[PDB]
Design a protein around this ligand. Sequence first.
Ligand SMILES: *Cc1c(COP(=O)(O)O)cnc(C)c1O
Lengths: 450, 453, 447, 449
Amino acid sequence: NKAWLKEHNTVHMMHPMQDPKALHEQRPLIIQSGKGVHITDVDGRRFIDCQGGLWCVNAGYGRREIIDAVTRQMEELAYYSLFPGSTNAPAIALSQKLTEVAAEEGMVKASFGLGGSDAVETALKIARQYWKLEGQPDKVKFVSLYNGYHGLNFGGMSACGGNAWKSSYEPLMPGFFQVESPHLYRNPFTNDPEELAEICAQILERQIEMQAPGTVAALIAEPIQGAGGVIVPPASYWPRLRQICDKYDILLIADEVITGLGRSGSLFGSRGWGVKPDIMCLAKGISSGYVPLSATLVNSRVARAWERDAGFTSVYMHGYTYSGHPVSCAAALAAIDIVLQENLAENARVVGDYFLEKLLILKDKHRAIGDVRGKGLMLAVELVKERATKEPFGPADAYPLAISEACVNNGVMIRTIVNKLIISPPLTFTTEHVDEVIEVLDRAFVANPW
Amino acid sequence: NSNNKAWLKEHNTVHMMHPMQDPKALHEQRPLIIQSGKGVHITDVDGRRFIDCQGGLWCVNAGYGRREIIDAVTRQMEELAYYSLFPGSTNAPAIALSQKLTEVAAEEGMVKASFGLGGSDAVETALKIARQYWKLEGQPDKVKFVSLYNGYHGLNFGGMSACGGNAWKSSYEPLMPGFFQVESPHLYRNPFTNDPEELAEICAQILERQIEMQAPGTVAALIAEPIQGAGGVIVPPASYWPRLRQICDKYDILLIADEVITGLGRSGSLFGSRGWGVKPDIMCLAKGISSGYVPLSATLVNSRVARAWERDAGFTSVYMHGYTYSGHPVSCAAALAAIDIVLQENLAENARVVGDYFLEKLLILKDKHRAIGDVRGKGLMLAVELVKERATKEPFGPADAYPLAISEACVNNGVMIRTIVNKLIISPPLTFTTEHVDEVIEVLDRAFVANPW
Amino acid sequence: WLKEHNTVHMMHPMQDPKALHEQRPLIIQSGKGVHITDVDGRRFIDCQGGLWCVNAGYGRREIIDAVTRQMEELAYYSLFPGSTNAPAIALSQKLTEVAAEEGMVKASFGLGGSDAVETALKIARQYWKLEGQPDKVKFVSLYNGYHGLNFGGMSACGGNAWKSSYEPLMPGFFQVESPHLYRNPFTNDPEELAEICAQILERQIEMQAPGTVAALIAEPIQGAGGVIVPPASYWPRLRQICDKYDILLIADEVITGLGRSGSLFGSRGWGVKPDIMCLAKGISSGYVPLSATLVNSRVARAWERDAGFTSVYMHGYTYSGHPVSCAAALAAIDIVLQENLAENARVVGDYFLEKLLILKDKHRAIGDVRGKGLMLAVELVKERATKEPFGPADAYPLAISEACVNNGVMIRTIVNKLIISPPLTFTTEHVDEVIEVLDRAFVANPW
Amino acid sequence: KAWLKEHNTVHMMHPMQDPKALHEQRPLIIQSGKGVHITDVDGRRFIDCQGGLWCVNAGYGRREIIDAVTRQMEELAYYSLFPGSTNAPAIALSQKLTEVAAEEGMVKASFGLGGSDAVETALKIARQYWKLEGQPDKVKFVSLYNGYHGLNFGGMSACGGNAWKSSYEPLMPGFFQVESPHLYRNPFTNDPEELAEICAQILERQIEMQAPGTVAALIAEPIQGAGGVIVPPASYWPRLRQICDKYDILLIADEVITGLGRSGSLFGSRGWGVKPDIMCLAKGISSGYVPLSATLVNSRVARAWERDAGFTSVYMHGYTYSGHPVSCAAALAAIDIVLQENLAENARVVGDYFLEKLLILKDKHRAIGDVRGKGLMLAVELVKERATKEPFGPADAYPLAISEACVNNGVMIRTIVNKLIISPPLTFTTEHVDEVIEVLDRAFVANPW
Ligand SMILES: *Cc1c(COP(=O)(O)O)cnc(C)c1O
């Protein structure tokens, strides 16, 4: 019951991303239930969930379609592997559905996992094996971007573009390099986004040339950087990435764990930039968070390498016990059907557009707002101590937490990443939900002048 | 489409990268599409029924069709499908499961749980915890990991780097620096001795000497399975793990017990390490922790480890690890129900007893059939190792036909047993009975009779 | 047994063995002043200065006699536990004297630039372990940097030519944009280029987390990278950055050390005091192999900590402090100081660069001319508007080089760049001779 | 002379030492050498059992080498082997080395300046070789416990003792060290033939575990020097050659000490009847008169570069002073001395005599746990108790007491922890042996244990 849960909250847990010392006195809310876009804690406090779980409950809470798919599959066959000798029906169905839905990008095969970190890990392993199959085993290095976030296994962590995720676990993998990215609001080059895109592309090219292209396997990048603070690159940037990868003969890995299946207002973030990656990483929203599932998709160029007469090198020696878990796959199938039938990519585009417009008005109103960024239903409000210098609030400062808490205490679940308020609701959000959130945020800023 | 047999058959493997396999092989040799499971049996799309000696993949420990787990899952999914343990929030099944796991592993001294989704995550988490632990304790040079020949620790770059068989490693090199593997006490294939106690002591001394060579001040942890699973069901001598604990105490490195297979009963004790009377510093759990019904893993730590975060160490004491689906309320609901099943039906004891019986019956098979070079087991993990000649122990290769013939003769007579190279692997649900044992042994015997060597 | 065995039993440095079957190198037999003579009596002005190293010229009785006298007295004894030797002690004091402006108080000896760099890298790592920050293990360096050939130095190089055949190299070595005005994607303003490259360096350090970074290593003027002189503001910014992020500044002075760039040290030429300095090549005028890695008081004092085994310096080669090498270096350093060759390099190099700019005006193939003191390069391009370089396979640069060699001037190429690094005793008359021959080479090979 | 004493250690980073120790315990300033004797600045004369540092193999004051050096420096002090040029002493020395190492199949030399350079060169050569042969995954190096392979990052990563490694971590990925057949200290057996076979099988299984397709080479010393003069069983190195052949990895012989005679054969590998793929030489190659190293390769390795492989066939290695004409002139004179005076045979005979005398000493004094030697490479290992083989630690006084008694009675012998190391010039005589043995005997008598 409630008292037991409150007593035991955090005591036997290593909570992600937190210092356990802070949790002795500052206990997290015990979220008890969800319906639609709202969540309710054990004490009955109700919120609009602007976190959307954690960028993943894209279809909303309480979807009977997914619950029923999960129950029926688990009643019939709770588990069987895709390891030598067997497969299962939901995994087959989901594999075909994914090659269908990502046909535009040229995806022809799926490798399943359980979350975004393993989707990324799978992608990195695939790239290395691909080049060994292609008779270029020196191609082993990975390039990624400043502010990129690619998950927490040693591979993805080595590919991350912020040291916060890396420093305590060093030394990380050799051969991982990060380069300047087109973050307009904080860059040393220019206030022109097209010039910024081009200078960042050329920096990337010159680092690749420095490494020797014959030693580089792939570039990995998010179409829109999520955990790095919702950084939307200039539209010319990703086409340049595709050109650079073609030029130096390295793979383009699109980390679509957040942008996959609609959030940024296109069915894929790459598609939103009109770019076809070689490899795509999907997780989070692909199952609406109801059951863990990830998928790494590859194109024919990549897949055909395993059709070489290469002996043991053509054995795909990867894949997790729960790869293709039939309950995961059932959930993912129902969620993708919802995404398509209700055109949540378009709803994200429109409601996200409206949301972004209202935030821009809010920015003019409240001096602590240094920057507002968004595409579809991924948005961030960046708070600064001084607009002229763009000096950020530190993790230690109180103001971001004050704004967050004023929202939370008035029924709007918005949390921070350092100095940035992050907005990533379910893709079923309405303009009315937007107006509610904007009203509460406005009141929060009014009550906390800067 | 998930109910359309001819569709399933025509799209089987076409759009998928199957684990551990050459896609060239799958155009003509199509895997069985398993459609349903009940108890210890599974049924394919064509209605063929099998005793599932794979136990899914060492993980359906409670059996198929368990209403307890199904209902727990449904009810939790109706209430709250998901919410994170990230700054600001938690959920009730995650709190409950964290407390349950520390209770069940009280004997080993486990006080905190870090959740993930599968064994590879559990291992990666253990490795990250060890490195951060030693930075917290003011010894940041302690970064190296030692593991064992034939060890399997999953497939992310960390775990893969810790594996003791190159099959999982070579296509993805170069792997992580600072991972070293040493001689392990594999009685059937070792260059030292036919005496198991002498083998344990020599392997212990070899380990010590490699640690000393690395300099202990650069080594963070030893990782090892209480009984090696994918390496081919290799049961160490009883003295080995107590020596491992002693070696770790002597050199001041952490002992990580990879219990992804042995955790929660399969080897005939609730934990493999407990089976050896050893308390690890960190325990990796997955697979059977949820009976395979929903992906879940847990990495447990003792007080010694957890308290390193209880210091003013600035940003070094922020645990910057944890997966989006860490603590998934549905996964945790499933794991709570499976653990209640394991405890209430004493599946650790059933694994112990029925496994002892299974191993005895396997020795009869070894007596009759020349190709069986070795039979191994503890609790309900067993292997039958096939060799071309017993005097030399020359193994069948992955390319050879005999192991596969024995397997197919079983599958075609209602017994799902597959191979890892030259070894037939047996890891059924822990609810297996002695009568199930005899059914499988009769089928296996007939397979060997039909395939003389 | 010389022309018949030339290259036959040899793995020649920096070369494709396929090329050596087709055309064999000149067997150089003798040297005098700034001239060299081959086995057939062909005489050349040596614009290579051996290999950036015969800084005092050939045939210096001062150095030859120092060497003979020492080898007659004591050919060798080590600096290992229990022993030392006199020339090593003397050279130690001389180096701390000469580099007093930079704050250098200790030297670790070696045999060449690669070991000097390896020594600096090991010192930096051990320093941070002594200072209680063992996570500080990564190294940052510059595009076009050249830091020798052992695995550390090779890892630190900023050109892939030295790297790709030996991969995978050391983890934790990162290279960043450097201010090469002639070829950069940012600006043609050198002050703006210096500042943008400094900010790029800062942001890469921050990306790595400064607590994982040990040191920056850089050449005051980049040599093998093609004689790239940075803007004057750049190195003060490097010192500022290293102070801000608490990483060591390693100055690779293997070429610029002891006068070639027109200051006794390149870092001095920029008014910057490094934490660690690498010296080789010209330190002994190439007469006997010798290198020295110097450290300041900040670095040295870390070993005075009660740190147990961490404070044992487990580095140093058999021939560290070789008495003959040290005697040769003492004589060469005396010559550098006695004849003020740093000032001569400054003045005659200024003159050389002026003459080269006139040549640039005259001949379309010269895209850029660069120099500081007596390190100069003429960079040849297929079209100046695009700066398209000649490739290693192209004939024109080798044609110019061969016309010089066939007219008594030893100038070789680094790809599309003619490199000039003569002895520091070079005169304006030597300059005019070389310039006339170069001019006729261009006239005879019109572009 | 007074200035030498005042500035001793003051401006210097002394190898292998804590600088705090050097403020008060100053090293002896060695001033001159003749024959096998050295003299310090105070006129104290010593028999140099260090042979400089395993390197003054022809003795001190050799007119042949001094004159070769002087005349060469008089003619041409330096010119490079870099694109466009070469020099005569370099050509001559390459041919001489290919002739002297003909038995081993050595056909090409890449020159350097010291043993660390020779090892680094071997490692780079191996990696580039396998890339040329179309197997670029072959990058890992296996070496032996107690192996010493110099101090650059590659060689340091290959070392088999952590003392050289821990202060500079993290070292290179892909370097692995295995059990070696050190009879005196091993967990397996007191039978050397059995020890050789078990260590060979441990090496095989580690290679197999790594996957042979990822391993470039094994590097090992025919007799381990800095690790404490560890002589392997005679069967071991033939097994090493068999293993390298079986798994298709290169065998690198680190002959920096054993090269050119010290162990009683012209090469240690020859002493074991084994032909390596790559050989590392330094130290004695020039009798220590001028810094020089050479890395030799056989036809198997060399032919890889004769391929149309584009840039991969460019040897982008070689130091400024590779093939330094003065160094090469010195080495040619030193090799001439080694051959004409058959110093390999003298090392064999006088070393066997030396080892016999040391065994008598072991019978005499309980502090001696073990005596080891081949040719003029010998060690006396001191232990606090023979039954347990408990060593003296670096902190203990007894080994230093024995060493100081020898030094104070005219015999220059130093320690590596608990081991007295003996490596005199290869011109050592039986008379010299008896001189040293008398002094050592009295040192032990004066310091009973
Ligand atoms: C002494 C030694 C080295 C070190 O060589 P340096 O000349 O000191 O660089 C390397 N390898 C072996 C086998 C040695 O004996």
